[PDB]
Design a protein around this nucleic acid. Structure first.
Length: 802
RNA sequence: UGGAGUGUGACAAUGGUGUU
RNA sequence: AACACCAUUUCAACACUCCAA
């Protein structure tokens, strides 16, 4: 439970398809770079200030040192060539129109060891080296661009994309230095956001208040305009233009600049009441061109510092946080999240205009970055045959990641004979005609799906308030003998849903299915179809199974599939969910959910959860799992060592305390949807759909993947919009000794066992289910709430989370 | 609350050190 | 009570697109 497994082989299954990744090949020298620690007092200075201080320290001490370093911004310094120092601390003083800086030697970072690491020599890739290189590549844009999080943003070169108000669209990019199979690469992905337009505040008022010009009004119209302008400018930073000095707007004055008064404190004689306009007229010899406009209150309310709008400009680099209107959000998504070729060309254009090969800090260390994206081979895996049943027992073949139930019926359809209707929406907007039409349409779709509605509901009543849920359900449960389903019509977002699911899933164990109000009014066959999928699954039926004869050889012996995900509160306990397959299809899953420490992603009581699932598996199959496939979802790389250490033991421990010396092979895999890796089709004809993304099933385990460890990219879903995010899978452990092809095919095949739709999903079904279970337990003093997530006895043996 | 896909969030929340 | 900074938390929220010929 310490070391991750090496990649066994390279996959050879599927049709090859020429690809390009958003990785840019880097040429890195064998030179050793030198690392030094800085010590700066005071110890609270912002990063930008630190970079500024170091910048001053470099040029003013060229006679002693620096015969061109890079900076972290906080206690990390690198130089290409060495300097006159030692392990001893060298302290000096600098001045900024007053700081004390101490430079201390730390260590040497050899890039020869980096080549030995990228090659087959050293198995471990020095993290300190990756950090150093990343600091080098980020040093310039950290000062040149506007840093946000881990990305860098900037304005537009020619055109200027507006948003209205004081906003406009600034574009940016996220860079990160990553290790590869043979050569270091630079990962880069573009993005966009909304910044405040760098303009005079007098024009900001014009744009916020919908003025063609400021001379449209000679006097302030209303208190509401004051509130609106304040709502937009309160909190923003502005620079002055009659001396430079940056200020922060705390409020907007009620009175015009001609009447806005303040304590003048004219040297001696203390304060005299003076208006802002008279002040700027006397002191700064400036007559206000627009004295009828209010002032910006800046700084402290006790300080009484006001500024006319015509001397203030909004400083650039200020991102917006305010709510975006329809046109703003539209123009945003109408200029970002574009199709795959558009994003591809944007990244290329970015790599062309960023020009890393001409920047001094990059050239200092002799680093060369390829201006073209990295070509990668890639290969499209083969979609599994989906077996439907019914009278004909037809087969569905996933075309482009999507199939349908046209002339097909469920593998195990359920004859629904007893069911109820409880509408919580007002009868005024939801007539009985809507309910009957919805009933007819539902019955037809149901019977067509192989899950026939054998007749009208035994119950149909309107209701209101969540307090009506628990009593009614009890009555419903006691009146009608052997009811199968309770359909709950909701008028939108309401606390009713949470109680419906609480009473339904935990308290009584009744199969409940909520439907939004509008879908009851106007009904399409597709919606009713997916709804039937959910119903048929919730009632214990089987929608569809993988073709039994068309499965990887792992199924030749009893094997269980586990999925795990963790959800954190908005102080409240977090909840971890672990699901497990309960048959050999594998279609049916049982859910286990626990409560945990705040924001602790490491599943603590995992062992017991696995124990339950294992026990339930034996109860449902009469077979003991010779293999355990654990899909962990939600953890990032920085948590791997931690998670893999505990949870794997937690799994293994569960296998020991159960029976004798029963130790099946555990295959610990980490699913990751959140990453800055994009894949594009090289051939224009290979593009799929409007979004023009890579075809569903695209598999990559070369060039852009880890040099030594077992990981692979799999785009298992078809891109509906924008650019697809290929799900990344990292095998942290593997006792079963999977081949690349086998595990990739198994994973892609498990992406077809999703029971809520006739499509291929981005992540495997167990992980998705685990996410649904977790998010469901969200709707449901610590030991008290620990039993709140404990679902019902009869609900446990079902997929209520579906 | 029919479903899937992908954009935004990072002046985010907390515990920590520290400031007139 | 405001304000800085260091280490963590991709959790959740909102929105959009797609499911006529």
């Amino acid at each position: 439970a310490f070391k991750p497994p090496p990649r066994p082989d390279f996959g050879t299954s599927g049709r090859t398809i020429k690809l390009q990744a958003n990785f840019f090949e880097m040429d890195i020298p064998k030179i050793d770079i030198y690392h030094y620690e800085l010590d700066i007092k005071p110890e609270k200075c912002p990063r930008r200030v630190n970079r500024e201080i170091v910048e001053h320290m470099v040029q003013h001490f060229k006679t002693q040192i620096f015969g061109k370093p890079v900076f972290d911004g906080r206690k990390n310094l690198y130089t290409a060539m060495p300097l006159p120092i030692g392990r001893d601390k060298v302290e000096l003083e600098v001045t900024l129109p007053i700081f004390k800086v101490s430079i201390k030697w730390v260590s040497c970072v050899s890039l020869q060891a980096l080549h030995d690491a990228l090659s087959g020599r050293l198995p471990s890739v020095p993290f300190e080296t990756i950090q150093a290189l990343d600091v080098v590549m980020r040093h310039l844009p950290s000062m040149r661009y506007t840093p946000v999080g881990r990305s860098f943003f900037t304005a537009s070169e020619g055109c200027s994309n507006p948003l209205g108000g004081g906003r406009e669209v600034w574009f940016g990019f996220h860079q990160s230095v990553r290790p590869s199979l043979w050569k270091m690469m630079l990962n880069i992905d573009v993005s966009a956001t909304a910044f405040y337009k760098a303009q005079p505040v007098i024009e900001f008022v014009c744009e916020v208040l919908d003025f063609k010009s400021i001379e449209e009004q000679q006097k302030p119209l209303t208190d509401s305009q004051r509130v609106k302008f304040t709502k937009e400018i309160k909190g923003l930073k502005v620079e002055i233009t009659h001396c430079k000095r940056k200020y922060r707007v705390c409020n907007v004055t009620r009175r015009p600049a001609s009447h806005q008064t303040f304590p003048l404190q004219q040297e001696s004689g203390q304060t005299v009441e003076c208006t802002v306009a008279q002040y700027f007229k006397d002191r700064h010899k400036l007559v206000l061109r627009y004295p009828h406009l209010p002032c910006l209150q800046v700084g402290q309310e006790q300080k009484h510092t006001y500024l006319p709008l015509e001397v203030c400009n909004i400083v650039a680099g200020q991102r917006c946080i305010k709510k975006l209107t329809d046109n703003q959000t539209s123009t945003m998504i109408r200029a970002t999240a574009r199709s795959a070729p558009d994003r591809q060309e944007e990244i290329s254009k970015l790599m062309r205009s960023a020009d890393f090969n001409t920047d001094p800090y990059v050239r200092e260390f002799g680093i060369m970055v390829k201006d073209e994206m990295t070509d990668v081979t890639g290969r499209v895996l083969q979609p599994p045959s989906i077996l439907y049943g019914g009278r004909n027992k037809a087969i569905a073949t996933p075309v482009q990641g999507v199939w349908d139930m046209r002339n097909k019926q469920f593998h195990t359809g359920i004859e629904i004979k007893v069911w109820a209707i409880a509408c919580f929406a007002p009868q005024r907007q939801c007539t009985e005609v809507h309910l009957k039409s919805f009933t007819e349409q539902l019955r037809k779709i149901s019977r067509d799906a192989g899950m026939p509605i054998q007749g009208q509901p035994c119950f149909c009543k309107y209701a209101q308030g969540a307090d009506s849920v628990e009593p009614m359900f009890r009555h419903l449960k006691n009146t009608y003998a052997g009811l199968q389903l309770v359909v709950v019509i909701l008028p939108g977002k309401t606390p009713v849903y949470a109680e419906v699911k609480r009473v339904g899933d935990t308290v009584l164990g009744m199969a409940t299915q909520c439907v939004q109000m509008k879908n009851v009014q106007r009904t399409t066959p597709q919606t009713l179809s997916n709804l039937c999928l959910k119903i048929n699954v919730k009632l214990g039926g089987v929608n569809n199974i993988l073709l039994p004869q068309g499965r990887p050889p792992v199924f030749q012996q009893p094997v269980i599939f586990l999925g795990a995900d963790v959800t954190h509160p908005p102080k409240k306990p977090s909840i971890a969910a672990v699901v497990g397959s309960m048959d050999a299809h594998p279609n049916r899953y049982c859910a286990t959910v626990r409560v945990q420490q705040h924001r602790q992603e490491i599943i603590q009581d995992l062992a017991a959860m696995v124990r339950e699932l294992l026990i339930q598996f034996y109860k449902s199959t009469r077979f003991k799992p010779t293999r355990i496939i654990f899909y962990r979802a939600g953890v990032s790389e920085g948590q791997f060592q931690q998670v893999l250490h505990h949870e794997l033991l937690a799994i293994r421990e569960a296998c020991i305390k159960l029976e004798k010396d029963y130790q099946p092979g555990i295959t610990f895999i980490v699913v990751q949807k959140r990453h800055h890796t994009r894949l594009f089709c090289t051939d224009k004809n290979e593009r799929v759909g409007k979004s023009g993304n890579i075809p569903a099933g695209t598999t990559v385990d070369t060039k852009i993947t880890h040099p030594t460890e077992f990981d692979f990219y799999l785009c298992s879903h078809a891109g509906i919009q924008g650019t697809s995010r290929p799900s990344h899978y990292h095998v942290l452990w593997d006792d079963n000794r999977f081949s690349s092809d086998e595990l990739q095919i198994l994973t892609y095949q498990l992406c077809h066992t999703y029971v809520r739709c006739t499509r291929s999903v981005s992540i495997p079904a167990p992980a998705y289910y685990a996410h649904l279970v977790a998010f469901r337990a969200r709707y449901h003093d610590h030991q008290a709430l620990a039993k709140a997530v404990q679902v019902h006895q009869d609900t446990l043996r079902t997929m209520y989370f579906a």
